[PDB]
Amino acid sequence: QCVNFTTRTQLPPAYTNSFTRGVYYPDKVFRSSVLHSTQDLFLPFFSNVTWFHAIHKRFANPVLPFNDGVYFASTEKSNIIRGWIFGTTLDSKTQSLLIVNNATNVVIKVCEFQFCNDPFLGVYYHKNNKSWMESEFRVYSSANNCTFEYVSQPFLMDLEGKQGNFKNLREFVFKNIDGYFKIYSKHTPINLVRGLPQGFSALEPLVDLPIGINITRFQTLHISSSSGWTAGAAAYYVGYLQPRTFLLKYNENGTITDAVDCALD
Amino acid sequence: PLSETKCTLKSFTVEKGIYQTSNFRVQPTESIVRFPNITNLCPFGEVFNATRFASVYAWNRKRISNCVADYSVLYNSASFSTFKCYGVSPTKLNDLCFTNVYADSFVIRGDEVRQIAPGQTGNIADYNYKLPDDFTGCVIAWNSNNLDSKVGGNYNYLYRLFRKSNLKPFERDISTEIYQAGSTPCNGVKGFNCYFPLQSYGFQPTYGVGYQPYRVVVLSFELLHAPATVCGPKKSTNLVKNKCVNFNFNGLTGTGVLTESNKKFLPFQQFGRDIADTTDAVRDPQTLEILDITPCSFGGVSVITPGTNTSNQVAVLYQGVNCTEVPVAIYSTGSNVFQTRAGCLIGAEHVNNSYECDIPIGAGICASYQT
Amino acid sequence: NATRFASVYAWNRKRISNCVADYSVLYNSASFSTFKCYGVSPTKLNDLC
Amino acid sequence: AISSVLNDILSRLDPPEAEVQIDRLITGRLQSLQTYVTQQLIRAAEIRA
Amino acid sequence: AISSVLNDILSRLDPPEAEVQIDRLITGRLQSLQTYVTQQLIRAAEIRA
Amino acid sequence: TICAQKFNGLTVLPPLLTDEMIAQYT
């Protein structure tokens, strides 16, 4: 199923300062109490990250370029953002990548998808058991050749609650290198209203799938009488990775605690 | 050890002193071999024994993963006209571990096979299948004349004769776009100095050796830089600790003493490194336990001797060695053993009465030949 | 583009000097059955002195 | 060399190719020892002084 | 090596062939500067004395 | 005001006069 979502306010693009965020573990090797220098595609420190958000009034799901890999971050309450579209044509002429982060696990699927202009997911509210249940995935109209599929280790995430400010920070790195698509991730608690949180944490690798397709663009997947809805407040940030040398500090428990960007100043 | 000092000094007479001789090194008690318990064999029947391969302009690329290899069946096969490697020896393939393995399958003329090797050039190497200068992998081929050749010519196999620019290593261009060799533009299907980009092979059973069709499979796998998915047919042995062993954990070959480590590897991590960026701990690939790796004890051997004109009695210092190691190396009689801060001293009597230094041993200790 | 060449036992030797060459016309022309170099690459002839 | 680890050369190459790769490590490791000993002899003269 | 100028090696040999001559020029110049620094360290002791 | 060094064939020898013996001459 596909619906043309027309209810939205038009505002100019916003930018914000990424203090020290966008660092991830580049390899699967343990290190502790050492200073290790490494160069890889990271988000440069103190760079202008682009800002998008859903309000009341706002619902950002536009197609955006994907050049050299992208840092994604999300400041959120009530679990509104549910996935991403990655690909080149997104209309069944070629394969395309669909990633969805539902209540229980992460699902990754590569098909000859024919995507919708304004895609969205849906939740049944108070259906008999009086619990909110993810039940709709109105994102593509057809999937002609589903070559790749992956399901992550399962987890339990709630689908209910209300707070006066954003409580969860979810950070992801997506790279498409030599046919191998890499996903890194980290979750961090926050107490912010409308800005990119100040702090530092390294993203742990999640999965490396040899999907072999071209990804040049992506599109966000947000969760919702047949059109027009109230968008629950949630916001995300988009930055592009650059080849940068960093000096990484490992603590006694083998966790990156600090980093120095060799081209910063 | 006295003959070893006479030998080391190149003299039949040796003055009173302490002289260095061949280093002591504790040897492996036994080997350890550990790999994940995977069983299924790789798709070598579907790669090398397929009914037909593709034309060289659209060469097939098949992924081989999560399987055990058996290269003795392939290398020992009399059907193969060449089985040549460029970054490994064919005999080492069964004694070796593989990160990613890709099979590149295609058909070309025997005269054109010379261009498939790494560093080559010419219409095939330039327009359809190029290997890198530092290519690691193996090129396998066999005469397929009975399978793919016809008396009038099996023109179903094509190559690329025309292209706008040369292609990069492992590039594949299936496109049939008409090529303009002249400076004048063209339209439709053909024209003056305008050519269809592909050309068919003249595969006939009357062709001379070299002019006949050969099937080529090139294995372009990678080694020792990523988590393994294809492996050698090696049975995993039992795992032991608290002993000096020749271990191998998923290709991590080395000699050392294994012990239970307190290093907290993260869920995605398998190997642990020190400040020197060298392996000092390993998680076993079958049983999820982390072992601290330390190499066996070793150090120089110092021979303590009075003058040759004095006595043939000598003492031996195993530098940097714990006394425990001596019985392990079963002077093994002992009853003269003493651990010094320089190492394990054997063949010398420990005396509590302090004297003036004579032959220096190190760490405050000296030896002398006395009544 | 001469009318005719000499017999190979008396091969002609013409001097080329004080002029600019354009080797893309020769290399890119489909009329030539052989264009093989032995101390330079055919692609370098246009970037060469 | 194809690797700094002598066992990775010997695990992959035969007696002909492995010796060619190992000679690169012998020459370089030998130069690294001569560099260390030269710096230690020159620093030993500073410590002697 | 063929020539001490690196541009002459790069503009002549093919990529796989240039690596050999470049290795000769790098290793040789590494020994050249190492010998220079060694002698400068030796003379540094003379001027420090 | 080491383990990797001994593990790579590098051996460090103790002084003949220990930290107490040098202090005893002092």
PDB file of C-alpha atoms in Angstrom, chain A residues 25 27-36 148 178-180 204-205 210-212 253-255, chain B residues 61 63 100-102 222 227 263-277 280:
ATOM      1  CA  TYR A  25      35.285   0.468  16.610  1.00  0.00           C
ATOM      2  CA  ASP A  27      38.068  -3.548  13.767  1.00  0.00           C
ATOM      3  CA  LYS A  28      37.209  -6.662  15.862  1.00  0.00           C
ATOM      4  CA  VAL A  29      40.459  -6.637  17.986  1.00  0.00           C
ATOM      5  CA  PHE A  30      40.535  -6.105  21.771  1.00  0.00           C
ATOM      6  CA  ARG A  31      42.777  -3.314  23.153  1.00  0.00           C
ATOM      7  CA  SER A  32      43.029  -1.875  26.722  1.00  0.00           C
ATOM      8  CA  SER A  33      44.953   0.932  28.510  1.00  0.00           C
ATOM      9  CA  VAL A  34      46.686   1.958  25.207  1.00  0.00           C
ATOM     10  CA  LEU A  35      46.782   4.849  22.708  1.00  0.00           C
ATOM     11  CA  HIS A  36      46.147   3.544  19.152  1.00  0.00           C
ATOM     12  CA  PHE A 148      19.464 -10.956   0.746  1.00  0.00           C
ATOM     13  CA  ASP A 178      33.709  -3.057  -2.086  1.00  0.00           C
ATOM     14  CA  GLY A 179      30.271  -4.809  -2.089  1.00  0.00           C
ATOM     15  CA  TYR A 180      30.185  -5.160   1.776  1.00  0.00           C
ATOM     16  CA  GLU A 204      30.010  -1.221  18.350  1.00  0.00           C
ATOM     17  CA  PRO A 205      29.890  -3.150  15.000  1.00  0.00           C
ATOM     18  CA  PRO A 210      28.006  -8.766   1.286  1.00  0.00           C
ATOM     19  CA  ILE A 211      24.865  -7.324  -0.437  1.00  0.00           C
ATOM     20  CA  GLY A 212      26.762  -6.248  -3.625  1.00  0.00           C
ATOM     21  CA  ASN A 253      38.079  -2.272  30.523  1.00  0.00           C
ATOM     22  CA  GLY A 254      38.969  -1.869  26.835  1.00  0.00           C
ATOM     23  CA  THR A 255      36.575   0.917  25.920  1.00  0.00           C
TER      24      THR A 255
ATOM     25  CA  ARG B  61      31.211 -14.414 -10.112  1.00  0.00           C
ATOM     26  CA  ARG B  63      30.508 -16.618  -3.739  1.00  0.00           C
ATOM     27  CA  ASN B 100      36.383 -14.575   1.365  1.00  0.00           C
ATOM     28  CA  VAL B 101      36.438 -16.805  -1.738  1.00  0.00           C
ATOM     29  CA  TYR B 102      35.083 -15.816  -5.156  1.00  0.00           C
ATOM     30  CA  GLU B 222      41.629 -13.216   0.396  1.00  0.00           C
ATOM     31  CA  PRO B 227      36.854 -13.486   9.802  1.00  0.00           C
ATOM     32  CA  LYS B 263      40.393  -9.735  29.418  1.00  0.00           C
ATOM     33  CA  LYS B 264      36.775  -8.723  28.568  1.00  0.00           C
ATOM     34  CA  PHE B 265      36.426  -9.190  24.806  1.00  0.00           C
ATOM     35  CA  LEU B 266      33.304  -7.503  23.370  1.00  0.00           C
ATOM     36  CA  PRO B 267      30.708  -9.716  21.517  1.00  0.00           C
ATOM     37  CA  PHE B 268      32.173  -8.836  18.057  1.00  0.00           C
ATOM     38  CA  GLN B 269      35.853  -9.307  19.193  1.00  0.00           C
ATOM     39  CA  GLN B 270      37.934 -12.566  18.869  1.00  0.00           C
ATOM     40  CA  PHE B 271      41.667 -11.654  19.315  1.00  0.00           C
ATOM     41  CA  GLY B 272      43.368  -9.471  21.966  1.00  0.00           C
ATOM     42  CA  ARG B 273      46.425  -7.303  21.431  1.00  0.00           C
ATOM     43  CA  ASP B 274      49.085  -5.697  23.609  1.00  0.00           C
ATOM     44  CA  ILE B 275      50.628  -2.149  23.493  1.00  0.00           C
ATOM     45  CA  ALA B 276      53.078  -3.507  20.858  1.00  0.00           C
ATOM     46  CA  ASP B 277      50.074  -4.441  18.566  1.00  0.00           C
ATOM     47  CA  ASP B 280      48.458 -11.631  23.709  1.00  0.00           C
TER      48      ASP B 280
END
